[model samples]
Target chain A: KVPTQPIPLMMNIFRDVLPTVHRYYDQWKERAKSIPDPELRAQALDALERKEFHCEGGGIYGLLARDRFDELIQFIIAYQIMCDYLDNLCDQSDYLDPKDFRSLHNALLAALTPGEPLVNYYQYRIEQEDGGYLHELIETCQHILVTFPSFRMVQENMLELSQLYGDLQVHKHVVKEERIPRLEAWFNEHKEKMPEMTWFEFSACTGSTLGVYTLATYATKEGLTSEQADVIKAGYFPWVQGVHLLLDYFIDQEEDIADDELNFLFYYENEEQMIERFQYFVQKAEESLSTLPDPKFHRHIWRGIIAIYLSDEKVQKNKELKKKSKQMIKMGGLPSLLFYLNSWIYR
Target chain B: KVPTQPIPLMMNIFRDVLPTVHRYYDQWKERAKSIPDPELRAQALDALERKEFHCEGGGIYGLLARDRFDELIQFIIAYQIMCDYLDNLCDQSDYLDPKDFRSLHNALLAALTPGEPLVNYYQYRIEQEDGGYLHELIETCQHILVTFPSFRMVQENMLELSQLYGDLQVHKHVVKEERIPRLEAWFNEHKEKMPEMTWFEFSACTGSTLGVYTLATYATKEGLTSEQADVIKAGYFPWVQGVHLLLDYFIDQEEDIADDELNFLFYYENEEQMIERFQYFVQKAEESLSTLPDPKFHRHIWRGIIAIYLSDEKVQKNKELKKKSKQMIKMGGLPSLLFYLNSWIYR
Candidate 1:
């Protein structure tokens, strides 16, 4: 059966959260100039602008999926923006330098730690101050972690994910020559201990933000169980996150090439091989969704993501990507077509 | 007809330069530890190691493509390594900050500018010293530009390409939220003044190292004309660079996805359109090859790039990429197949 639309959630975000964040984006950009170092200033402004979009994405996801509103939505939005901005610091900086990366991402560790003071994140590099932007971001995460009952239930899982995320940021970004080898070494070290996954697949698991997003969605729910939280973590971590990230990389072949950046799909043998793997992830996603309380709602999210990314306007605009998208659409088969239409309606 | 092999140049680098550079890599890594800031030290180590690989790529490219090997090859290798290391500093560091990126990559500007003294490049960031690593890199480029006969013919074109490259590095690596828009603005600002190309395509042109590689290949030749030099620039700039970069990105889709990186292919409409466009680039590359004096050598580069990337062990190993690669091979037609076989024999 055709499902209900998700426009209300989109509307809620548009009406309640977006304008505030949009206004904040401008203020933040202006405030970024206060950083004493011109380089840091530019970085702060750029990262703030980038975080603005993540704020919007998180706000939409929270409002639509969880029926969240007011401070709860705002809290989630702020934490997500922190994550995105922090990510920019690690990723855009020298991958060869892990000390600063680890120390800076300690902000992330602290965000999940709830009550750890957000202090001296720029210790290794810059002395420039940012008028409590980082502090406010940390406070937002801390408040949600401490006050929210649902967050307590899944606190361990979130911490575990955050730790993994932090480790990956340090390990993954180190210089290119050692990067692949180090990653392989890391995978080998962990392979025996963790569940079975390719090195790249495990990397995808580390890169996912879905864990936090899912936790936020469930943070206020009553009667949530550890088992359910475990399932959600599993659902999002390896498989769902895999598909989301892979699709994102799939579309960006040209851009990554231009920049000589590392790509996950480069690890695969070819298109058909990647498609098979992707389909397997889709199946896993379906199985994971079936186990959820609101299977339909989860399914909408799953389909929604696929549709939105596949039908992204950039796909239509670029001639080269246009061809690749059609092939991907063909590989995606019936469900993909349905989502394509679904996306058109809402998008 | 099958072309003759160029293994002698490879042998020269492997035998003479590789061991010395390999030792330098280790020495550099140790020297990296001396940087007082742990973060900068780690960055130095990682970048030094990463620079090692670029040294290898340049060595191989110079040895095989260029007729004679001496200071010219060393000069190319050194210049390429500098580019690679500087790229790490900008790209791997904070994505939001362009001022440092611009300043650091100014090393590129100095490298291309013969006789320009390497000054305090670390003025904006860490106080830790690199013991003239950046200075040595600059001198290599200067020696080649001032001394090499053929390089003088294409000096103007090389300088222009370098400027574009430097500008793009600062502009392109910002966070995703602002990256494309900022790049578009940069593009629009220069659109009317510059040659006609899409923003992304222009990005590809900027990202390519072929201009330097080509210039190096022709560095010793006598009687090279200004018009001929312009043709070489035209040949390598947009179209050849486009295919080279696109294929590299194509193979790296999985890697890019895992890393949450930006890929150019993501901006296209679908697969068919991109495949067609890629083929068009191939045609353009062939046409460009025809204009060069030694079309055969240039053809090898074109074919070799396609084959090496397509036949990458990662592609062979990953089932998904394998299927896609086979399909791509089919689409690439006869020369691609021949080169596929050619790569297998040598690779």
Candidate 2:
């Protein structure tokens, strides 16, 4: 839903992203400044602003105002990683199987230099099922995570949202309504297990899902493996990381029943002991996910999956209430009483 | 708030306004194909797009396409009307007595002629206070209207709605925070005596009060006699329009209440008998607005005033709801019944 029109997207990327890459290119461009290709950087800027040159070829920023070698290397690597993620998402349907995900994982691992600290860091996080790396990623990406809404508005505002929404539905219709049904008849396969969910229902519910775009944006910037990123988009990441929060609430429902923080969840039936069901399912998923050689991707995916549950409305609201309540309680009493009393008495 | 630049605003009608005016000028260059200066038009388009050539004297699309006499005449007259409205909004601070408003009414009427049936029709509607000319102006100025939001967004979505919420603080600030608080001050001074209770409150509640941009844009496009178009900036428009809408909503609050409508007027208490106040106010305003001697000028001024108010969310949302309701009813479903069904069905 980003990039309302081709031209605007081109301009936006050219304007926003090229600068980031350009800073590094500045060093490289200095050496080639004397090469005299008869093209100048200022001239290029003028060409872009003055409509003198087209932005189509050589990408929107026109070779990054630097030597082609370094820029090309980065561009291709990013492109490869992007393609790999898309491949995992759209092509590799049996992704849960270790064999099926291995090639994709290997392709993703190849994107980074072997000695990159992030690559090692990510790998270790996967091995340990530790949330430290995920927390680090969040902390590093805190600005983006908070400002995610604005980026969504910019990328997928009216026109772009309309186009993506349209295209996604068309693809879903062709694949689910026609292809899946036809394949089931011809292959004599289990129809119920094929798609896991009705495409229409999935899309209808998922259309409003903000996590996919948020996770994609975060992963793209953070240099995560494609599979690592896909864990979130597949809805597994947030589910894994945060599903415990939901399960916890369900398990503690009776305790909450004695307390007062149980209103919204009452809407769901069987308000007690849903945690056992949650545990069984999560354990099954973890057991299966752990068998893969790269548990890193699965853990990263779990971080995002479980985050959805942690980031639930009730929980978020509860957190906000707790924060405010603490502030007010710490400053208890009348405004006048607090001013003189807090400095001497409370301290 | 307009530029969203640190955000958007006004002045130097020629320097600031002309550049944008010129861009809009180039977009309509095709309409001037029959002009003797065809080459000039082409060059202007390039200059406008490329910043190679810019209008020092300044004119937006209406003037650029002036070779099409039919289009030019209609556009110029509209522009002139806008200019007059701007002068009134920007320069005039003296509260308009009924006589002063009558003169405005006559000025609008006097601007029309038999040759332009559409203008004549609007003029007649102005005479009747039926809101026809205002509606027509809004419909005709499609480009101007849609650009309002985008203009704000270009500097980023800077119109923070939160800034407008709570207390009568924004109102107090609007009237007195800045120097030369013409519109807001005038409104504050006259609000109680104003005839339209229904119009006043609806106007006060939203940030759309700063709608003078529409009037200012029209003024920039069509010749208004108050000042050279080059001297005016987009920024001055909102304050004028905001005040205008505030006054209008205050006047109309009661009538809206009577209609059982939930407009911005919901902010006010004890609205039941306020409907009578609105009826009296509207009647008084109509009487004054219709009695002006110069029918041409009267129609034009009224049209401009109407154009400013045309940006109201109350007006826009009301029209949208009505359209949707009409569609539902036409499809053999009562809108009210559907609304009731939705409420109870879900609950």
lDDT on C-alpha atoms for all candidate structures: 0.66, 0.32
Q: What fraction of the true interface does each of the listed models get right, in terms of native contacts kept? A: 0.00, 0.00
Error of 2 at A330 (Å): 43
Tens-digit lDDT string for candidate 2 (A1-347): 23333234334444433443444333333432332323222322232233211112112322222233233323322322222222323332421232332332332222221222332322311122222322222232233323332223222222222233333322332333353343234223322532342332222222222232323243333234446444433343223322433433433444567854322234334423333434444654466446432344444434333433233334334655334323322222222222222222222
* lDDT: worst 10-residue window of model 2 chain A: A52-61
Give the C-alpha miss distance for residue A163 in model 1, angstroms.
1.8
Q: DockQ (Cα-based) per candidate?
A: 0.01, 0.01
Candidate 1, residues A113-170, lDDT tens digits: the string is: 7878667887776533667777767777787767666777888887877777777777
| Best-fitting candidate, scored by lDDT | 1
* B180-218: candidate 1 lDDT, tens digit per residue: 887788778778965556777667657777776676666
